[PDB]
Amino acid sequence: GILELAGTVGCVGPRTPIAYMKYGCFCGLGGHGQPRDAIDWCCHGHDCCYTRAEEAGCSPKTERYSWQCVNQSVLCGPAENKCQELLCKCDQEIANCLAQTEYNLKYLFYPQFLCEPDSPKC
Ligand SMILES: C[C@H](CC(=O)O)c1cccc(-n2c(C(N)=O)cc3ccc(OC(F)(F)F)cc32)c1
Ligand SMILES: C[C@H](CC(=O)O)c1cccc(-n2c(C(N)=O)cc3ccc(OC(F)(F)F)cc32)c1
Numbered sequence: 267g268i269l270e271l272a273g274t275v276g277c278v279g280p281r282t283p284i285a286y287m288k289y290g291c292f293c294g295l296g297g298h299g300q301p302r303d304a305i306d307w308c309c310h311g312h313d314c315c316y317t318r319a320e321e322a323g324c325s326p327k328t329e330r331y332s333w334q335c336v337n338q339s340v341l342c343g344p345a346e347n348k349c350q351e352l353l354c355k356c357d358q359e360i361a362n363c364l365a366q367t368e369y370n371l372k373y374l375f376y377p378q379f380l381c382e383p384d385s386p387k388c
């Protein structure tokens with residue numbers, strides 16, 4: 267869920283998870299358009315990951331899972347079911363993706379009216 271999303275992102279990367287609440291066209295609730303930069307691409311991939319988990323019968327926003335932060339790396343588990351492993355994998359993936367990025371301040375609170383109706387495929 268959102269609790270673990272924040273935690274995992276914080277674990278691996280250098281910045282407050284707040285930084286991704288509203289960034290580019292994809293970091294934030296929903297998302298559509300051309301991803302603006304590497305960060306936005308990470309969020310696009312993560313949005314896609316969450317869609318796949320919803321399609322698998324999981325609740326990515328709320329469902330709790332266990333994980334550990336070791337040397338700024340996320341280790342997933344232990345899992346009780348497949349949804350916990352799927353969600354941890356999604357969040358681990360975005361945490362790793364974002365940690366390798368430079369933050370572009372100009373995409374913080376980027377206006378939604380500039381984001382295109384069409385998006386890249388998942
Ligand atoms: C966005 C940017 C992330 C980057 O450069 O890496 C940044 C820079 C400096 C401080 C913060 N920053 C932090 C923090 N610990 O760095 C907490 C916090 C809380 C609210 C807030 O304002 C807003 F508008 F971004 F929510 C901004 C907040 C974020
Ligand atoms: C869960 C929902 C997925 C949806 O609709 O799209 C959502 C809502 C708001 C922000 C994010 N969201 C995304 C994202 N894929 O949009 C990346 C990310 C990274 C850290 C983070 O931390 C915090 F604190 F903002 F929650 C929040 C983050 C996700």
Ligand SMILES: [Ca+2]
Nearest residue numbers: 292294296297
């Ligand atoms: Ca999103």
